[PDB]
Amino acid sequence: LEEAPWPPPEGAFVGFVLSRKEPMWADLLALAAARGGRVHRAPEPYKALRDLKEARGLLAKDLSVLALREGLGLPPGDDPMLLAYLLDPSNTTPEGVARRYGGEWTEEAGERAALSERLFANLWGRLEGEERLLWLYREVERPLSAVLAHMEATGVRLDVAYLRALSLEVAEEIARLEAEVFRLAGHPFNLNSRDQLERVLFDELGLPAIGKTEKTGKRSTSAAVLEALREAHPIVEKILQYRELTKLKSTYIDPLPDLIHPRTGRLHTRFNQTATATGRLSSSDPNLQNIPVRTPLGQRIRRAFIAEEGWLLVALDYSQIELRVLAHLSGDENLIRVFQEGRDIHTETASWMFGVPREAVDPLMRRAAKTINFGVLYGMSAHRLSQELAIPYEEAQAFIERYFQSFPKVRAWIEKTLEEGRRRGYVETLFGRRRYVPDLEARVKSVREAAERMAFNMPVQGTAADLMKLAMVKLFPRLEEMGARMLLQVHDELVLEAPKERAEAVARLAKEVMEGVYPLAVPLEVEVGIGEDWLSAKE
DNA sequence: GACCGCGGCGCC
DNA sequence: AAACGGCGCCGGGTC
Numbered sequence: 156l157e158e159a160p161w162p163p164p165e166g167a168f169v170g171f172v173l174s175r176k177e178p179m180w181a182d183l184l185a186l187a188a189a190r191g192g193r194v195h196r197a198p199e200p201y202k203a204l205r206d207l208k209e210a211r212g213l214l215a216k217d218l219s220v221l222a223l224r225e226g227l228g229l230p231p232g233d234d235p236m237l238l239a240y241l242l243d244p245s246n247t248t249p250e251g252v253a254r255r256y257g258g259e260w261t262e263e264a265g266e267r268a269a270l271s272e273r274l275f276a277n278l279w280g281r282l283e284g285e286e287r288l289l290w291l292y293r294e295v296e297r298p299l300s301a302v303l304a305h306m307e308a309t310g311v312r313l314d315v316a317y318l319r320a321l322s323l324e325v326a327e328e329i330a331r332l333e334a335e336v337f338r339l340a341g342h343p344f345n346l347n348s349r350d351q352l353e354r355v356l357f358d359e360l361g362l363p364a365i366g367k368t369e370k371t372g373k374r375s376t377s378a379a380v381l382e383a384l385r386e387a388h389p390i391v392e393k394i395l396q397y398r399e400l401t402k403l404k405s406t407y408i409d410p411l412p413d414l415i416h417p418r419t420g421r422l423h424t425r426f427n428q429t430a431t432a433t434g435r436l437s438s439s440d441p442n443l444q445n446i447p448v449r450t451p452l453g454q455r456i457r458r459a460f461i462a463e464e465g466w467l468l469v470a471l472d473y474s475q476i477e478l479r480v481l482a483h484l485s486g487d488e489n490l491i492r493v494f495q496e497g498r499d500i501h502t503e504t505a506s507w508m509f510g511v512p513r514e515a516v517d518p519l520m521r522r523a524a525k526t527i528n529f530g531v532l533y534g535m536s537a538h539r540l541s542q543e544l545a546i547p548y549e550e551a552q553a554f555i556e557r558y559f560q561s562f563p564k565v566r567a568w569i570e571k572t573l574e575e576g577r578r579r580g581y582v583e584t585l586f587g588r589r590r591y592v593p594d595l596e597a598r599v600k601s602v603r604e605a606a607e608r609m610a611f612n613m614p615v616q617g618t619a620a621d622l623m624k625l626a627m628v629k630l631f632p633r634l635e636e637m638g639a640r641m642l643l644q645v646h647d648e649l650v651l652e653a654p655k656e657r658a659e660a661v662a663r664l665a666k667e668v669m670e671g672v673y674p675l676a677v678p679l680e681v682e683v684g685i686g687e688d689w690l691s692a693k694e
Numbered sequence: 695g696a697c698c699g700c701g702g703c704g705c706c
Numbered sequence: 707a708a709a710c711g712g713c714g715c716c717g718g719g720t721c
């Protein structure tokens with residue numbers, strides 16, 4: 156492969172090496188390109204970046220993110236990963252893709268640029284006459300790679316000094332719980348060690364072991380088990396509280412302050428485009444799609460995510476999203492009618508569950524209600540439901556009968572999808588995104604029924620993922636015309652940063668864009684809110 | 695020091 | 707734990 160001097164011509168494929176996996180933190184150790192049987196190895200990578208019209212290759216977005224960090228508007232174009240991920244969503248890493256489709260993922264920039272060339276050719280051949288996947292690539296994923304590059308580069312502002320103060324109060328409160336716990340135990344032990352805790356609960360005290368752990372068969376100390384033991388002993392309550400506080404302290408309060416980038420003074424997630432089986436995104440390195448909200452301390456954490464001074468945050472969340480999508484995919488007249496009447500299923504279940512007026516339903520209850528409703532739908536057992544509702548197997552049985560009885564045509568939709576998946580080996584979204592579910596023909600029932608549950612979930616969760624992705628592609632250009640930013644996506648939610656002056660305008664627009672993104676047999680309602688912080692914005 | 699599998703748990 | 711699904715990150719060992 157011919158070594159040509161550096162500058163590549165128009166349309167050349169890129170290859171690059173990083174010091175570490177995160178583009179906002181990485182040093183650019185090497186940069187190369189390749190077109191028409193040639194390799195160009197940049198002598199100084201950072202300068203060499205100025206020459207490029209676009210990032211075109213494996214992980215184009217990562218290089219575009221790093222380019223944006225350096226003031227360069229190098230947008231991402233073609234990426235063989237995005238092609239492979241639509242061909243098969245188990246195609247998730249370049250190591251795997253390379254091997255599957257005719258190369259080897261190396262550590263040298265040149266070799267990676269040549270890999271990008273030959274992998275694109277092969278994969279692009281695999282997609283000719285795959286009309287719906289080509290549609291998805293050009294009209295959703297490829298433009299989206301650019302939108303995410305801008306989100307990553309921008310980041311979100313975080314109240315550092317606030318969280319540092321919060322850390323010290325939690326540490327005091329944690330210390331009280333461990334000191335209580337040890338006193339009831341009658342001796343000190345590492346309370347973060349679940350093995351030690353097992354012995355204390357089940358051997359040293361006479362507590363009944365509810366469940367075992369999957370891989371190694373140890374007696375489980377899961378919150379579920381511990382809730383079932385709330386009355387057995389006082390120490391349980393303390394353990395549950397200790398578990399909440401240390402989880403949040405070790406995962407959010409302490410790491411996040413130390414992850415502020417020095418140039419930006421902001422927090423930059425990575426939005427992994429080829430990471431899930433359904434077509435959802437994932438967020439990592441810091442994961443900002445799992446920031447706390449539920450518990451009071453979780454909320455105090457969430458409010459640490461704030462706007463730039465002079466700006467406001469704008470949070471938009473699709474209402475009852477996967478239920479609405481389901482009603483379209485199934486055509487359940489009875490279920491459509493619920494959304495045509497503007498009724499909230501999460502509130503109805505909540506009001507019913509706790510036995511209260513709908514106006515009394517709080518967020519805590521509503522969250523519990525979602526578990527009930529999605530759980531049933533996707534195949535939760537009567538056994539579990541009973542404990543989730545905390546009511547008899549007699550009565551919890553009757554719920555899966557009545558819930559399903561209201562809305563037929565779904566089960567008809569479930570059966571159909573599974574039969575199609577048996578026949579063709581995959582299932583698909585409304586836009587023809589595929590997931591191969593080969594264990595539908597599995598001879599072992601537990602493995603078969605697991606596969607089935609994954610199978611009929613995907614079209615629903617994945618269609619919703621496609622809608623949110625599409626809405627993002629359409630919305631992003633309109634935001635930059637308004638001098639507003641797109642900050643985060645949390646599956647069916649978007650978080651925007653708009654200047655106070657234009658904040659309400661952005662909110663109105665972005666709602667209409669999201670609701671009208673692709674009309675269906677049901678109206679896609681969106682809840683929007685505005686605030687100085689993330690918590691206030693959703694309230 | 696890097697990485698591993700596990701149990702556990704935050705969010706959607 | 708439990709026959710909901712989809713994620714990524716945290717705190718007893720190997721090498």
Ligand SMILES: Nc1nc2c(ncn2[C@H]2C[C@H](O)[C@@H](COP(=O)(O)OP(=O)(O)OP(=O)(O)O)O2)c(=O)[nH]1
Nearest residue numbers: 472473474475476477478525526529533647706711
């Ligand atoms: N299978 C399953 N899916 C969930 C669960 N929680 C959330 N999801 C999926 C389905 C939801 O529609 C979607 C978005 O989560 P949200 O918190 O926005 O819930 P949803 O939109 O249904 O209700 P909302 O009206 O927005 O509060 O993610 C769950 O516990 N199980």
Ligand SMILES: [Mg+2]
Nearest residue numbers: 473474475647
């Ligand atoms: Mg929602």
Ligand SMILES: [Mg+2]
Nearest residue numbers: 472647648706
């Ligand atoms: Mg949501």
